[PDB]
């Protein structure tokens, strides 16, 4: 009865969601045909012919990637109209997804959301998968958030986006499209979770025993975090935390709502037999800087608030002992106005294994959602790129030639300046 609406836009969000929706089918015993041989109602809709269809929307202006799903393994599971394709891409331009091509198809995208949202008995919030560096993932994310917040006045918004890595970078107009999105998503989004591509390359190497990681390795592992953050709505446990609360106790101020995410234990098949999976060791792996999923150093900054999302065969006694060890450590530092920062959420379902994955069959798991002050180092890195590139007015004629004015370039730097100065004002102890 509890529902969630999933929106995918760009190439990253569709390609991650191909590895996200392969997990929900096997967890509930749903075939790729869409037929089983009430915990599934949060992600699937019952039809009178005994066929279950996902409640997710796939949008990309470029039609190359969605034609893979329509002709691939999952052609009979998705709804034929929930696969919305444009004609031409955005091509690393934010204006080509926000003013010219993002204007023609925005009425068909918002029409299907109203079709899905009417069937839901109780709607909780949105889960949106995209990337900050793309043209569609920055263009068609931005005006959709501008239009969704007008229609649905106060529903919760959770974004799982791909942050640009500090060194490993693919596109060339990356620092322009990163700044122009955060002028929109700062006030039309309530909690934005960040991951990058470099920090999951090495986690795939030191832990999974994989020398050459593809994108199929990354998108499967981000597919496991989303199934762990949702797990309280899906299964019963000792104490449940739902989507309404942990988006209100991780946002202390209206402008500082940018947390991190990590998953543990992340162990291959060979190493897991020898190693003893204990609750004290799993929660100690979460706080190590080498197990962060974003290339940043959490020791330099101080945590504001934290959340724990346990699973499987876990008791709440040794969890409280495990939290007590963390609070007595000296490397982990907290800001003075948050004496109570931890969350506890326990589910009774063990983690599942995918035939074809590279993770081992474990007995428990955990997810951590940490609000830190060490992300301000990451954005100060990228606004350094903006000032040095805009000093010579490079790549500006591709922007003004498709709809925006040049004055938006300066005023979007004013917003990331005021966002940056707010982090030092809150991290200072009183």
């Amino acid at each position: 009865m509890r529902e969630c609406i999933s929106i995918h836009v760009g190439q990253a969000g569709v390609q991650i969601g191909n590895a996200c929706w392969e997990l929900y089918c096997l967890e509930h015993g749903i075939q790729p045909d869409g037929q089983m041989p009430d915990s599934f109602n949060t992600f699937f809709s019952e039809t009178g012919a005994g066929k279950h269809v996902p409640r997710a929307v796939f949008v990309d202006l470029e039609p190359t990637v969605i034609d893979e799903v329509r002709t691939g393994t999952y052609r009979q599971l998705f709804h034929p109209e929930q696969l919305i394709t444009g004609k031409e891409d955005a091509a690393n331009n934010y204006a080509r997804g926000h003013y010219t091509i993002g204007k023609e198809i925005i009425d068909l995208v918002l029409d299907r959301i109203r079709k899905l949202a009417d069937q839901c008995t109780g709607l909780q919030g949105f889960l949106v998968f995209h990337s900050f560096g793309g043209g569609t993932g920055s263009g068609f994310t931005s005006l959709l958030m501008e239009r969704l917040s007008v229609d649905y006045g106060k529903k919760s918004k959770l974004e799982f986006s791909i942050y640009p890595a500090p060194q490993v970078s693919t596109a060339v107009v990356e620092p322009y499209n990163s700044i122009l999105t955060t002028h929109t998503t700062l006030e039309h989004s309530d909690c934005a979770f960040m991951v990058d591509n470099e920090a999951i390359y090495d986690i795939c190497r030191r832990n999974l025993d994989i020398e050459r990681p593809t994108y199929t390795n990354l998108n499967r592992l981000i597919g496991q975090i989303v199934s762990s953050i949702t797990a309280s709505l899906r299964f019963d446990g000792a104490l449940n935390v739902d989507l309404t609360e942990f988006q209100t106790n991780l946002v202390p101020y209206p402008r500082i709502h940018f947390p991190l995410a990590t998953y543990a234990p992340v162990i291959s098949a060979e190493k897991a037999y020898h190693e003893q999976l204990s609750v004290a060791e799993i929660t100690n792996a979460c706080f190590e800087p080498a197990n962060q999923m974003v290339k940043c150093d959490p020791r330099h900054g101080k945590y504001m608030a934290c959340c724990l999302l346990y699973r499987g065969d876990v008791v709440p006694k040794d969890v409280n002992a495990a939290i007590a060890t963390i609070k007595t450590k000296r490397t982990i530092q907290f800001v003075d106005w948050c004496p109570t920062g931890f969350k506890v959420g326990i589910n009774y379902q063990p983690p599942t294994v995918v035939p074809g994955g590279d993770l081992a069959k474990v007995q428990r798991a955990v997810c951590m959602l940490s609000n830190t002050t060490a992300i301000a180092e990451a954005w100060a890195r990228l606004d350094h790129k903006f000032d040095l590139m805009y000093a010579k007015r490079a790549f500006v004629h591709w922007y003004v030639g498709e709809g925006m004015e040049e004055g938006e370039f300066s005023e979007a730097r004013e917003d990331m300046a005021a966002l940056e100065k707010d982090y030092e004002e809150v991290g200072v102890d009183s």
Binding site: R205, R206, T214, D358
Partner: protein, 43 residues
């Protein structure tokens, strides 16, 4: 007289998802790319 059955999807060798085979034989690497800080990769 031979009864013949046809797979509807003519798949390609290049569109196979999985782990990428190392250029060297799984028994011995021509160039030793060890795991960082000792060990062996799975193969």
């Amino acid at each position: 007289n031979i009864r013949h059955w046809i797979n509807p999807k003519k798949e390609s060798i290049h569109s196979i998802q999985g782990s990428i085979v190392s250029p060297h034989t799984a028994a011995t690497n021509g160039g030793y790319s060890r795991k960082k800080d000792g060990g062996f990769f799975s193969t």
